[PDB]
Structure formats: C-alpha cells, structure tokens
Design a protein around this ligand. Structure first.
Ligand SMILES: CN1c2c(nc(N)[nH]c2=O)NC[C@@H]1CNc1ccc(C(=O)N[C@@H](CCC(=O)O)C(=O)O)cc1
Ligand SMILES: CN1c2c(nc(N)[nH]c2=O)NC[C@@H]1CNc1ccc(C(=O)N[C@@H](CCC(=O)O)C(=O)O)cc1
Ligand SMILES: [Ca+2]
Ligand SMILES: [Ca+2]
Lengths: 262, 262
C-alpha cells in the first residue's frame, strides 16, 4: 500500500496562505511530518483560491523537493500547471489526474509517458460520476486501452473509481469496492488502483474510523494506493496490517514500524 | 454482521474453573458483558479439561439462558454433547459445527433441521484443512448441496473457511478472503459465512489491530458472522462501520451505538 500524503492541499487554510504569501515553512513542515508518518508520495494541490495556479504548482514542487525525495503527485485539473510542475520535479512524479474524456486522454497519457510519470485515471467523463460498478469498469477499461495505445506501462496507471461521502452517497461505497475487485482480476500486467480515501467520511462522525475501515476493505479488493492522512497513526497501522493479511508483506512482530521505515 | 461472543469457552481459565466447580456466576457475567458489547449470539464450549462433557454442555446452556435470551452457539465436536445441549435450549440455537466429512454431514444436518437450528460448516474433511481456496470452495459447495439435500434453509447455513494465525500460516489469510468472495457468488439464496476471528492473531503482536483489520476485509468479501471478542470495543466499531460502508445499514451519526443497541 502506497500512502500519498493529502495535506499539502490549497483547500487547507494554512496551505492557502503559504502559497499566497509564498511562505515555504508550512509546506516543508507538512512534507516532513507526512513522510515521518509513512507516506511515500505527496499530493500537491494549489487550491482554487490562488490566481496563478501554474506558478503556484511550480512553487509547491520546488519548495517540497528541497526537503523531501518522495514522489510528487501533481494534483490539478489545469494541464498547463501539471506540465509546468513536471518540468520542475527532480524525481519521478505522479499526474493527478486524467479522466476518460478522449480530449484529456490524448494529452495526459503522452505527457505521462514523456516524463516517465505515473498517471491516475478517474473512471468518468463529461457525463459525470457513474454509480453502477459496470459503468465505472467500462471507463477503467477505456483507460487501460489508452495505456496500451500511448505506450504507458500498465503498472504506471492508477485507476481511481472515485469514492464519495458515505453519509449522502452511501450506495456508492459498495460499488467502488466491486469496481476495484473487477480491476484486480485483470490479467498481467494489471493496472493499479488508488482512492481519495478521506472523501468517504466527509461530514461524517468519527472520520478516522470510517477512513480506516474503508481502507482495509479497499485493500482486500486490490487497492494499491491511497491519497490519505499520512499523519493519522491508526490509518498507517491499518495499511501495514492489511498488507500482512493479504500476504503482500511477510509477518514480523514489528510490522507497523517496518512499514513506516521501509 | 452477527457477532457471536467467543468468551464462554472452556479453554479460558475462568470458564474451566466455573464448569468444574459448577459456579454459574462467572459464566452469567460473561453472557451479560458480551451482549452489552453488541453480541447477538454466544458461543458455548466446555473445553477439553472437564470429564463429563455432555452434562457440562447442558449446564452451560442452562445457566446462560437463565440470564440471556441470545441465540446459543453450541461449540463441540461431541455429537452427544450437541444433542443434549439443543434439548436444553429454550431459544433457537446454532450448531458449531459439522465439517465436509459425509459421516458428519448426515448426522449434523438432520439434527439442525430437527431442532430448527442454524449450522456452522467447516470447509474441511478428514484429509485436513486445505490451504488453496479452490479446495476450500469445493467443500463449501458440498455443504451448500447438503443443506438442500436435508432441508436446511440456506440462510441457516454458515460456512467457515477456517482462518489460521497470520504469523505462521500467513498464506492462508488471502485464500480465506478469496473463498468468502467465491462463496457469495454461488447462487441465491446464498449461504452465510462465519469465522473464528481471534485465530487470525493467535501468538501475534497487536492482536486487536489484526483482528479488526481482518474483520473489515472479510466483510468486504461477504462475511456475515464472526465468533470474536464481543467486549473489544474497537472490534465492534469496525463491525458497525463496515455495515455502513457496504450499504447494509443506513448511515446515521450514532451508527456505532445503533449497532450495539440494535
Ligand atoms: C477529491 N479527492 C481526490 C483527489 N485525487 C484523486 N485522484 N481522487 C480523489 O478522490 N484529490 C483531492 C481529494 C483527496 N484529498 C483530500 C484532502 C483533504 C480532504 C478533507 O477531508 N479536507 C478537510 C478540509 C479541511 C480544511 O479545509 O481546513 C475537510 O473537512 O473537507 C479530503 C480529501
Ligand atoms: C477455533 N475457533 C473456531 C470455532 N468455531 C468455528 N466455527 N470456527 C473457528 O475458527 N470455535 C472455537 C474457536 C473460536 N474462539 C476462539 C476463542 C479464543 C481464542 C484465543 O485467542 N484464545 C487464547 C487462549 C487464552 C487463554 O487460554 O486464556 C489464545 O491466545 O490462544 C481464539 C478463538
Ligand atoms: Ca492491486
Ligand atoms: Ca454475505
């Protein structure tokens, strides 16, 4: 399980301010804390508030890689910002993300291949987020075909079935799990999967509990990565424990500590 | 998710003592504690120490139902002990258990049907516990077939893939999850599934964490019941949260208390 730190996101007050005033401190500290927690990748989202998002993404990348060697997951719907971000990265990055819209596919897949970056693909298009796991799957298969079309190593494709809040879109959770299990059955080389975990507990009571439980359930269905709270110690324990239970990582008494220091 | 309290088991020092000295107190206190924790069924095992195991089972049933209206899960390999127990039960019971051995099947299935009791079926026979999910599923199918043969309503059949310790039999864990998943894809009305959860963490470190993480994973694979620690609050939290994430129970802020006081 690859945990992608979610905290360096412009939606958070401290990050929004850091970006606006160009204060590196808050960002670099979150990069450190998330890595200490067990994250092996960092999501970088500039947020919708800043004016020049292209310039903001470059800044997030520069100040982050100064204190971290972790993989950078450039999170933005602005392709110019993604491209500008990729050019600043000193290490392999992740593009977050592309959807099944052909227009975006033929721009982001070649871009990912060009930079040898991983690519996250959302199971949806202009038509919206589908509920049925079969519709989600069809979009997943469109991304898979695209990976073969543009020469992207299937192992560099992370399909995101898009999890929603369990309190107002509860019937989506089981559909997401089913979509993951289906993608898991694909023949080798099979694509990977990822989720914006925290979205499942938005506005719910005891979000950490809900996040933890869904992560474990999702991993049983093949989940490979999760954009989540890397500073949540109980979440990290779950990830570590789940690997053991799927026999992905050999058991030893200090399996949690080994997960955080691998 | 049906939690079957595991604590009333002769392997535990206090229960062994209570049975041998015929002291109702310890047993009745555990019955109340487990129900308060959220269990809706109580496993009753006399343990191997006591000499007269048939009268010990009748005694456990008598002292337990005296303070509890919960379904009693009679845990014993001695058919006579099971029969004497069922005869003492004032409420519907559960038999734990029968295996895939035909000799066991033709005695236990008709027994469960005669008493209108539920029946737990282990995916194993005299050749042992199979590691591969293919063979586990094969025995599961024999159990489903026997249920139709002897007239046991399918929802009264709980198939147990038999989970083993994650530190010495780690490769069994994923095979169990796969079995559960395939069991749910046999035919509706499909049979139910159950596990002796605590076995997965035997001799491991961070036992509660391993137990609850696996429960969540198993529920995503269809687990319907579990013989576990009904007094472990974190375990109950997971059970309650999993139901929500599988859309089996409508979400509300008090979903945990709601599960317990259900
Ligand atoms: C849509 N999510 C998502 C994605 N990328 C992919 N591929 N998939 C996804 O589902 N990128 C962004 C987001 C994942 N990251 C996050 C980050 C924070 C919170 C969150 O819970 N935020 C707080 C905001 C706190 C504050 O603003 O002060 C919240 O309560 O909403 C949720 C998801
Ligand atoms: C084999 N398990 C099992 C079953 N029935 C079915 N159908 N399936 C099962 O897997 N019945 C008994 C047991 C389930 N109950 C239990 C009860 C306790 C412990 C346990 O962890 N015991 C302690 C012993 C503690 C003591 O002796 O004081 C241990 O660490 O082994 C595990 C499973
Ligand atoms: Ca996978
Ligand atoms: Ca089920």
């Amino acid at each position: 399980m690859l945990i992608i730190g979610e905290r360096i996101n412009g939606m958070f007050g401290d990050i929004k301010r850091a970006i606006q005033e160009r204060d590196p401190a808050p960002v670099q500290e979150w990069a450190r804390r998330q890595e200490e927690g067990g994250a092996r990748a960092l999501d970088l989202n500039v947020g919708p508030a800043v004016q020049d998002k292209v310039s903001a993404m470059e800044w997030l990348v520069e100040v982050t890689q100064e204190v971290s060697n972790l993989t950078l997951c450039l999170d933005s719907t602005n392709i110019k910002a993604i491209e500008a971000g990729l050019k600043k990265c000193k290490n392999r990055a992740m593009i977050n993300s592309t959807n099944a819209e052909r227009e975006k596919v033929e721009k982001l897949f070649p871009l990912a291949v060009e930079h040898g970056a991983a690519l996250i693909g959302l199971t949806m298009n202009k038509t919206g987020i589908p509920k049925d796991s079969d519709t989600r799957l069809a979009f997943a298969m469109e991304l898979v075909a695209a990976a073969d079309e543009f020469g992207l190593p299937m192992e560099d494709l992370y399909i995101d079935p898009l999890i929603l809040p369990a309190n107002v879109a509860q019937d989506h959770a089981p559909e997401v799990l089913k979509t993951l299990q289906q993608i898991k059955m694909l023949a080798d080389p099979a694509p990977k999967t990822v989720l914006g975990l925290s979205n499942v507990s938005q506005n719910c009571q005891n979000r950490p509990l809900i996040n933890r439980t869904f992560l474990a359930m999702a991993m049983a269905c093949g989940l490979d990565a999760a954009i989540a709270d890397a500073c949540d110690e109980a979440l990290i324990e779950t990830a570590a424990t789940a690997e053991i239970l799927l026999n992905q990582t050999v058991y030893c008494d200090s399996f949690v500590k080994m997960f955080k220091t691998r």
